[PDB]
Amino acid sequence: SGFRKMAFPSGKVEGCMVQVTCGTTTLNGLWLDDVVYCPRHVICTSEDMLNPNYEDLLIRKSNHNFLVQAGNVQLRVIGHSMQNCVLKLKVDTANPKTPKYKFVRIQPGQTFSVLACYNGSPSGVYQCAMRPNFTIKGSFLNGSCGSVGFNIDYDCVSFCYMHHMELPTGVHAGTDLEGNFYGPFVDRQTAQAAGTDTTITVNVLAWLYAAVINGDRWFLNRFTTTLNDFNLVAMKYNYEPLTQDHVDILGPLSAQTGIAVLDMCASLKELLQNGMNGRTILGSALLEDEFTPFDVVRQC
């Protein structure tokens, strides 16, 4: 037993990371089949980032201006396309190590594993949630740009994220693998408001169930509540509204534990109104919202 924040094994992805250099800027690329994907701001200098005209800047670039290095293996670039905020560099060799893969655009509240890389070299793996306001709170130093987020189902890597920006607030923003930003963000070094974040209510509930399974039951109380009562409390406390879709997804966990969802909500309400009072749930002294129902089920 036991419960941990756990990333997917990164092996399949490590074999796809490349280094992409254009002019003076180095960052990470993702080589699948014969296409290398990377943040289009690889083409920018420091000053460029203040106010880039990506079309005009890219027009000053040809195929030979992109250095693609796979470990020590130089890749030959034979086409280049901008799609939203990604570059798609066509190279002459299919990646021998390409796994089965999909590109997916995930939803707020969903989670994924990040392989943080520098100079096309993996350095660490960890699990992130896409926040309701479409930021992530990661660990992304200078040159992490181009690191990707992914899920694995059996043999298939669903790439869902590529890192592009740290906001002045210190949170992180980026694209799907088609180059469309999550959230209102743009690939320019400018003031950008993320906007109010909220707790992923359904994740918190899933985590409470994981706590019950693991033997932490102190917070289980004598009350119940209704979706609407609970949702009123959710409002006050800056939590996402709970819907029937959410109740449904907790079904299997409510099934195992014999604790109906709305009884778990009344527990949550007591925690939101009374706090945790110096106690811990699954070793945490706040309410974790970084685990989906799927995450919890996988681990149980």
Site for ligand SE in 9-38 (CB under 6 A): 27
279 binds a second copy (CB under 8 A): no
- Looking at 4, 60, 222, 236, which residue binds a second copy (CB under 8 A)? 4
CB closer to ligand SE, 46 vs 277: 46
Residues facing residue 18 across a β-bridge: 29
Name the DSSP letter for residue 136: B
* Selected catalytic residue, list 16, 22, 38, 41: 41
Q: How far apart are CA 30 and CA 74, in angstroms?
A: 14
137 binds a second copy (CB under 8 A): yes
CB closer to ligand SE, 147 vs 225: 147
Task: Determine phi and psi for 168, rounding to 5 degrees.
Answer: -55, -20
User: Do 291 and 220 meet the contact criterion of CB atoms below 8 Å apart?
Assistant: no
- Looking at 30, 145, 247, 271, which residue binds ligand SE (CB under 6 A)? 145
User: Do 142 and 71 meet the contact criterion of CB atoms below 8 Å apart?
Assistant: no
Beta strands 100-103 and 156-166 are parallel
Confirm whether 300 is a catalytic residue. Answer: no
Q: How far apart are CA 190 and CA 173, in angstroms?
A: 13
Q: How far apart are CA 219 and CA 202, in angstroms?
A: 17
Confirm whether 41 is a catalytic residue. Answer: yes
Q: How far apart are CA 152 and CA 143, in angstroms?
A: 25
- Looking at 105, 126, 197, 231, which residue binds a second copy (CB under 8 A)? 126
- Looking at 8, 13, 22, 41, which residue binds ligand SE (CB under 6 A)? 41
197 binds a second copy (CB under 8 A): no
Chain residues that interact with ligand SE, rule: CB under 6 A: 27, 39, 41, 145
Chain residues that interact with a second copy, rule: CB under 8 A: 1-11, 14-15, 115-116, 122-126, 137-141, 166, 170-172, 214-215, 275, 278, 280, 283-286, 298-300
Residues with catalytic roles: 41, 145
